[PDB]
Design a protein around this ligand. Sequence first.
Ligand SMILES: Nc1nc2c(ncn2[C@@H]2O[C@H](COP(=O)(O)OP(=O)(O)OP(=O)(O)O)[C@@H](O)[C@H]2O)c(=O)[nH]1
Lengths: 169, 683
Amino acid sequence: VPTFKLVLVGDGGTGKTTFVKRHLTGEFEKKYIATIGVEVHPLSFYTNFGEIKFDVWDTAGLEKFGGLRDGYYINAQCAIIMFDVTSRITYKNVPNWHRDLVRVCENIPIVLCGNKVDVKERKVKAKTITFHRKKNLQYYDISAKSNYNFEKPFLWLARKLAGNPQLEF
Amino acid sequence: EALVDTLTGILSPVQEVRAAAEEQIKVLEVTEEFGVHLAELTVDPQGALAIRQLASVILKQYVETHWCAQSEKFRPPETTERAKIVIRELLPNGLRESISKVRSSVAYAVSAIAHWDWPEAWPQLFNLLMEMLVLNAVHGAMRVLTEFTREVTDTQMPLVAPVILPEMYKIFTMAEVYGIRTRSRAVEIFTTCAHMICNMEELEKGAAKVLIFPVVQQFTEAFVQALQIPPTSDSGFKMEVLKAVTALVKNFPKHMVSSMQQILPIVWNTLTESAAFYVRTEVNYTGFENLVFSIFEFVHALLENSKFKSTVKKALPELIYYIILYMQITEEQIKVWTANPQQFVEDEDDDTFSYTVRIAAQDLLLAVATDFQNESAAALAAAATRHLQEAEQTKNSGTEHWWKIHEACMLALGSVKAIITDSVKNGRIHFDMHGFLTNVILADLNLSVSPFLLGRALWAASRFTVAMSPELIQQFLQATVSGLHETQPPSVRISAVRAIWGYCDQLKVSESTHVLQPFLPSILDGLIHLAAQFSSEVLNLVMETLCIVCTVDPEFTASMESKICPFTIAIFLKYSNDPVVASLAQDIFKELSQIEACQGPMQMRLIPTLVSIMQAPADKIPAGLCATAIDILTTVVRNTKPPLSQLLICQAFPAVAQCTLHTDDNATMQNGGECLRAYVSVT
Ligand SMILES: Nc1nc2c(ncn2[C@@H]2O[C@H](COP(=O)(O)OP(=O)(O)OP(=O)(O)O)[C@@H](O)[C@H]2O)c(=O)[nH]1
């Protein structure tokens, strides 16, 4: 019944569509097909007390395929910055993604995540990352194939959305 | 009119209408009347604010795309001067009396415009008027200034900094009209400009030159005038000022040398007063966290500059006391940890991602210890003794919150065990280690004040094993093993598991494991029974402790392998996805495979499940599982005796062969690659 719009802003080819599909219905797809623009994959979730809708508004990473960056963030209720633990460039512009994200929507709970815990965790970026420290940014590490914390970001967002830290699927 | 319906489509989820509206945007933009429409839609009140933000952000795109034929992102329909002079006087009419969203969006747009038109110099003083006109109006100009000064390149910076920075100091010093928040944002603007200008001076000099460098002195004195003030009591404002002072210290130390001897005492007073306030208002509770983190970052930076290094060492024994004063567990954290043991295992871990005052203080302590090992050890000894004395004093009076100082003292003394225990080895201090363990650690194992103290005491006895009597060792181990039981709360159980890790490491390195020998079966039984209660994060620790326990003594494992092997295999199956679970399983099997007495049963119990995993379809078993199975097989075969078993050659070899043959997953082929490569190691 309640609809909660969130947003992915993962730079580069770091997994976002694989993530959303694997959560929507299916399994991991190896083939790289960069999304041009935004495709909402409605994703509802049942809870121990209630039911939550998370219309993931996946967005494009690369420049040329942007279309409308900052265009679809309006009327958001959360967001999931992203970057892969295997790439180095996907981190050094997380501050830029954050400034572009928190500007249009004010201080919505954002969970800086990390994909593919399987390959090499904290490989080229740094063995530790100091961006989530002071702000309202809950870090994590998930996987779209291994399916590791693959309910934890959405659990965190639901908890911080309804308020009760007791919600569970 | 119809100009706005498209934007509603841009906000809509349905793919078709969104694509249609996006193409409408891409096609109508070429008309010069676009920007004026965007402005008249975003500035006009009485409208869906979402549409306002949409128009403003699309206007940002416009200014980036059809304003400068020289920009790397130019589009054919360049903007006519008429629409330019129209919006340029119609756009700034926002920034006023609205929700911060649309104001910040209009500010984004203005900064985009102003990013181009500062050299051509249209009137850039309308916002300057809003500085003195009262509130919502000023917040708009402040956001404009922030965005602009973040946008200016290295070229404009030596020109715009000597213009903004004087007016910035004007705004800051004037504390009568400009509220706290506006002054804080002015400070942030100064810090941004200084950081970027020092970056430029690093790239191409010109910053510390005849330019703003004196204004740096002006602002330094302005800062050192601010911290004393309790109005303007906003703690976050003090946080911004302190962050700015850290910027000054780290960027150009040479200018800070003269006045820093005056800045240090007020920082010290802030630290002490904030320690008292925190202990009162958050620890014993029936943006300040950001302030504390700022003070700690300042101390960190102060430790960096070589000339400023000896400045902290002189007052080190007076700092570690307040550090330890900060490491107390807060009531909110006690509630959370009691309500969610997963969070207790994630946070108190020593490679965490959470960041609470406790963790920051712990980092500060580890740093100032690893930098001044001898001095820091002596200072930690003295301050721990002083804390012990004050704790005993307030204990005689029976204070309801006396133990939290014991927890923090134990944590500080353990988390740096190396330097302190080494200094005690040569007696460079006069801290009674035996007295510490007896009267402090062991004596508190018998109380009934709170579980977390019991657990911290268990975890603390772990570090100082190299200095304790054998009877003390037996006492501590007997208490710890009793800690894995179900009668105790989960937190003390988890801490006891960590203590068992510490024992199995230290005693083994100490080559004295025959003291742990009579405790193994109880230890392993408790570990096993724990792992079957809690699911993920507790397991991620239990399995590692189990690996170390196996490493303790091979004979015991050879006796009780019939327990380790089935549990480890069942867990590696049910919880195969996790990476650290897989690595821990592989480590168990590796350490287990050294025991030649375990060969038979381990192979007989594992190889069937391994091959059955290999045979299964790639789309039926959970993903990544085949890879971990292959790696486990590699470890088994490589880390075993040269003569191979009949089970491997008859099943493992053809199974992995056909697996590598018919597979297509890159990871599968890769890991199987080393598998077959390791198989060639046959003699
Ligand atoms: N091998 C492996 N790849 C993964 C895993 N999880 C995510 N991926 C990645 O998922 C990606 C699929 O691309 P998308 O999901 O569309 O993300 P993207 O490449 O940024 O594409 P856009 O959304 O258009 O930006 C692949 O490139 C994989 O690298 C994993 O667990 N294992």
